Amino acid sequence: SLNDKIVTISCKADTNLFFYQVAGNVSLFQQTRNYLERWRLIYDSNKAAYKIKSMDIHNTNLVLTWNAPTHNISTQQDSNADNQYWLLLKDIGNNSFIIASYKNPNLVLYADTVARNLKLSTLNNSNYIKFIIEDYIISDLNNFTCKISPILDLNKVVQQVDVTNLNVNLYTWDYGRNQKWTIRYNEEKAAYQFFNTILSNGVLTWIFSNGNTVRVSSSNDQNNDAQYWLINPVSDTDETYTITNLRDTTKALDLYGGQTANGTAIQVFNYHGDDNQKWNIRNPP
Amino acid sequence: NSLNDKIVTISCKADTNLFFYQVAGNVSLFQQTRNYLERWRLIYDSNKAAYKIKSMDIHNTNLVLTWNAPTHNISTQQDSNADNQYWLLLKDIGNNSFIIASYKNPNLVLYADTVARNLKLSTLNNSNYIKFIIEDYIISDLNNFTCKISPILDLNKVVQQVDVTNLNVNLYTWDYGRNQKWTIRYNEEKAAYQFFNTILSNGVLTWIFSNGNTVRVSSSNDQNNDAQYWLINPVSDTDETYTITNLRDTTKALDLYGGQTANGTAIQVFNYHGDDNQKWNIRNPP
Amino acid sequence: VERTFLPNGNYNIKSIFSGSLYLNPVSKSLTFSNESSANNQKWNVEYMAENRCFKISNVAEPNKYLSYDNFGFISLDSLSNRCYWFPIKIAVNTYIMLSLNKVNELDYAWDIYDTNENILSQPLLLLPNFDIYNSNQMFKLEKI
Ligand SMILES: OC[C@H]1O[C@@H](O)[C@H](O)[C@@H](O)[C@H]1O
Ligand SMILES: OC[C@H]1O[C@@H](O)[C@H](O)[C@@H](O)[C@H]1O
């Protein structure tokens, strides 16, 4: 289930620190939202263990390696060796992972947060050996405050009109709080909510009782799947996504007619994957 | 927290036919019994992020899996909420097994001695002797179980396929025929069950939804038909009584037509109300 | 003068898994490596009368003693109560090496992990001891 999954790995002892790779050196670094902190989990069924492979673009064959017998962890060339395999033990009820060496299961990864690197330790109850393994998309987007542009024009953004006008349309980027959205991943529903920053509990919502209309509404309406979305990456792109509603996953966030003029409606429409249904979720500059 | 208060059986990855067995403070490894002697409640402490493993013994009602420090021995002792009575359930992802480490000393984990047929604590390795299968006790009891199914309105009658060529399903007096016996199999992916009639190889109990409420036996090589799958829910206070609802529409329960008990009475599905004609006893064939 | 079952002096330290691998420091860890005939594979064993234990120092680094860290590894550090070892002689010169101190209110001992009796590149650890039958906790001290 984790095989071939690209993930980020962060520390339970410090959730702001992520496994970071450069030129064979593994360290703990703040969130970069890029390939430097992305890892592919490669499952070997015979071993019941995983290789943890760097998604580095320059060096494409680096895996998390225990420099046995030393206390040091690095990324070395994949030679499918025992010191390059790891047991991924999920601590149930705690939603964290213990990462034990296949070469010596007595030894598990230990997060040295003050030295900002990794080492090894026998098992204990400290958070320093517990890690948060998360799908990289979720890792990047969760609690990310963003602006959302259609690819048809990256100079415009999806916005709530104002604090009282809850309609959602396309408009030129003016750095307004009504033009920014804080994305939150709902673990239970396995979906996302877009919180407009001009409000406190206002989320992007498909008004299904009014056809294809989408507007912002309160998030204290608890059980409405129209308030939740699925964000799926477009291949070959770093920031482009398709956004589909949880009530009906065939309903995708759609730029009305593909029109780019100011005040153009933002709606949902039957998914076909056209350019007016692709969006760039970006850092507000 | 997703395992809190769950009642489970625990068996060995090294020998899936051996289960954690409890009696009078003694813990051993024993063949499947499908009863409380091999059932355990997982009790979660959020602060410790660890679990107590409480025996479902009906006589002694406060016994929990206990590490006899400083020895490597394991037993069940009165629950005093002690560190040597708490355990880390570490799920080996992709392997569908658990390593069960002592909360008191996580250097040590449960180790199955399948020749002495008991448990001890050990340091870690890559063998299956420190890996365990933790499963919901209903699933554990019902998975791969060959049974007969009777309405509670009359336990002398059973749900049966008419014969090898006649795939219809009706109520009839038990006669020990293979057409009257079913092998239950749990589907991990679908989280639902299939009832394989033992007179056929690939014949399963199926809601023929294109024909109203009719249920019949059909081939299981029809892959993606939720109507072939069922949820089996225990009735409270009972050891063998279940309601059986269809995966396609969970409001559709296995139903004894009119509550009639005569031979040849139709077995169907119907809107669930929980009446006695929708309650079934899944039992060992004598 | 002899006070015990194990005379003072220089030893080689081996695991029972291998008669050709020798205990030496590598970085901050201890491991069993190919014979080097160097001082770093020579260990000075000294009996301590007051506590009836042994302290074991590396001949190449005479002020460094076998100890343990807070991560389960055997280490080479300056003198402290973690450097005191309580051997259990189970054969001719085969010993189990217990820490003098109870660790986590248990007996803890030198432990070398094996993969089908192969210990190459394995660090020496300090793990719980329950008896005298754990092959991974059996070590040979050879006077040399
Ligand atoms: O809803 C009106 C429609 O207008 C079309 O031009 C556009 O391609 C569709 O995605 C939809 O927006
Ligand atoms: O569809 C026939 C129905 O007959 C009724 O008498 C009974 O209450 C239902 O459960 C169902 O069996």
TrEMBL record, chain B:
Residues 4-135, 146-283 form the Ricin B lectin domain. It comes from the Bacteria. InterPro entries: Ricin_B-like_lectins, Ricin_B_lectin. Pfam families: RicinB_lectin_2. SUPFAM superfamilies: Ricin B-like lectins (SSF50370). Gene3D superfamilies: 2.80.10.50. Beta-D-galactose binds at residues 255, 258, 268, 277. Transmembrane segments: none annotated. This is HA-33. The lineage of its organism: Bacteria, Bacillati, Bacillota, Clostridia, Eubacteriales.
Automatic annotation (TrEMBL), chain C:
Gene3D superfamilies: 2.80.10.50. It comes from the Bacteria. InterPro entries: HA-17_C_botulinum, Ricin_B-like_lectins. This is HA-17. It comes from Clostridium botulinum. The gene is ha17.
